[PDB]
Amino acid sequence: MDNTGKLEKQLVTLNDGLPKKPAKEIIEELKHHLYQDFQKFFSEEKKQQYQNNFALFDRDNDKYINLSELKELLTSVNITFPDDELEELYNEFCLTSPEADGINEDAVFIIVSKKIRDNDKDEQLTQAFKLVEKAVNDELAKTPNETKEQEGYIRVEQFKELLMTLGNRWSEEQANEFLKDINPKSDERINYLDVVKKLMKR
């Protein structure tokens, strides 16, 4: 009564669910699941092939490969990557092995185990957006007037309607932030190919 309030601006304080166990394993889950990809997605043939190829690479049988030999192994498997980023990844993994003159096999291969999911994200996004293009064509089939100048435009609000379902559920704030960054020209639409170029370019 008397409009005696009162709303509370619930700020979620960073004082909940703090991990308890400091410094031996507990992140072991993440890469383990990553391992299950090659513990799942890959046939054991490539595993054995890489085991033997590296053991050939491991001229000293130390399980490790230096910068030159790591680039050797990446090239032998047909890896085409810029020098810089591979260099920083190798440096990080060597920091993970401060007393070893290189990186161990598991961490060595994690270098592009990361790029595995990295490129899988782009592959899934491209497949989902090709399906989006097919859906747009299906919709335009029922719509005669839309001329060939519309070939490449379907409602951006629809871009957001679809994003959450194709490939991976996109956060509501994720879609809002992306749309705001792209900056549509107040026409309630953008060019899908230009967005594709931006997303494959960043």
Binding site: K20, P22, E25, I26, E28
Partner: protein
């Protein structure tokens, strides 16, 4: 628990790369030297909150 190498490997099946516990003790277990290779895989891991 004198499970030895067999028991240590059975544990490592998921615990070698498990990421749950805080303190794990296997003292007076006569863990064979060879089986230490399994623990070798635990330490070479970069993910670490035990």
């Amino acid at each position: 628990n004198e499970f030895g190498t067999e028991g240590l490997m059975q544990l490592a099946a998921g615990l070698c790369m498990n990421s749950v516990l805080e303190k794990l003790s296997l003292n007076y277990c006569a863990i064979t030297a060879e089986g230490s290779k399994y623990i070798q895989q635990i330490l070479s891991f970069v993910n670490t909150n035990l």
